[PDB]
Design a protein around this ligand. Structure first.
Ligand code: FMN
Length: 312
RNA sequence: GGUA
């Protein structure tokens, strides 16, 4: 498991279509699914929810839930689908998370978190990891954070992805990634205190240069919004992070997405399910706005063909 | 089944 660089799990963003796009930009970057509730995996259509392309490796499935047995079985199923890692969501502050007692509100019950992780760890052979916040209600302490890390490590967890801020359950989800202050220094300190463990820091990191800064202090960096707002924020990732002699081209990626789009349309996928994630491919580039316009207006393969000729 |  290479922890150096990852794209954050993002509901309504990091579905298989956007993940495929990102993979065209960076071969090395680690991909995460949208948060997927365990009940959905158990009772829903597992193909629709879990199926992914082999090119997406390395890829982790993120699960949400509160019941050890349900999550363990969901992890087992996730493993069967070929995911390289089962990630436990411990950071979602949504109203639905609060009603279902999952996500960030699990940090109130370390005993429960430990039995969840133990059950998950015994159900699969792939790494079981966590994505967490610094605490709840802005009442977090460094000792409290370290204690939670210890509890989870006792349960077998080695990889800790930390959104380096508290969660304020009274605020909206959007506000919960803007208002609570970031404390990346705490994640830096965790690595200093738990050298044997793997720490990936997350929150407000806008560029590869900024990621490189943190990579001097922690094992990895996870980027969310910056990547969706402009996938080519990862343009130099393969070369500067992963030491690969590879540099993507926006036009090459766009051409690959066209062939991808044709395959998907073939099997019933709505064109917009793919195109809606391609709007920022030319962010801040010449004709980038017309590109967005053409795709958003046409929402079809024919529209993509017009945009491609525009950018050729 | 699901964090503007
Ligand atoms: C639209 C959106 C959806 C998100 N969905 C998830 C999710 O499903 N699971 C999760 O652990 N975090 C989710 N998050 C939080 C991100 O993973 C990440 O921790 C947060 O955006 C801060 O990182 P960033 O500043 O690089 O974007 C989501 C964030 C956004 C903006």
């Amino acid at each position: 498991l290479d922890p150096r660089l990852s794209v954050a799990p993002m509901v309504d963003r990091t579905d298989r279509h956007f993940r495929f796009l990102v993979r065209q930009v960076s071969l090395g970057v680690r991909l995460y699914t949208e948060m997927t509730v365990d009940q959905a995996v158990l009772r829903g259509n597992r193909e629709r929810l879990l199926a992914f392309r082999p090119e997406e490796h390395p890829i982790a499935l993120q699960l949400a839930g509160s019941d050890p047995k349900s999550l363990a079985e969901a992890a087992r199923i996730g493993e069967a689908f070929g995911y390289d890692e089962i990630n436990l969501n411990l950071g979602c502050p949504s109203e639905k998370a609060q009603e279902g007692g999952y996500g960030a509100c699990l940090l109130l019950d370390l005993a429960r978190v430990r039995e969840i992780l133990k059950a998950m760890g015994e159900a699969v052979r792939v790494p079981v990891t966590v994505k967490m916040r610094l605490g709840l209600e802005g009442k977090e302490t460094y000792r409290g954070l370290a204690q939670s890390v210890e509890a989870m490590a006792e349960a077998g967890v080695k990889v800790f992805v930390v959104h380096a801020r508290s969660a304020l359950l009274a605020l909206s989800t959007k506000a919960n990634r803007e208002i609570p202050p970031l404390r990346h220094d705490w994640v830096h300190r965790l690595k200093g205190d738990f050298p044997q463990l793997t720490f990936v820091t997350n929150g407000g990191i806008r560029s590869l240069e900024e990621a490189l800064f943190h990579l001097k202090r922690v094992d990895g960096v996870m980027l969310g919004r910056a990547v969706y707002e402009d996938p080519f924020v990862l343009e130099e990732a393969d070369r500067r992070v992963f030491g690969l002699p590879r540099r993507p081209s926006r036009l090459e990626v766009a051409r690959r997405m066209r062939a991808y789009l044709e395959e998907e349309v073939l099997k019933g996928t709505p064109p917009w399910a793919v195109l809606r994630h391609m709007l920022n491919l030319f962010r801040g580039r010449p004709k980038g706005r017309l590109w967005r316009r053409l795709l958003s207006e046409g929402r079809s393969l024919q529209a993509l063909d017009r945009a491609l000729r525009l950018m050729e």
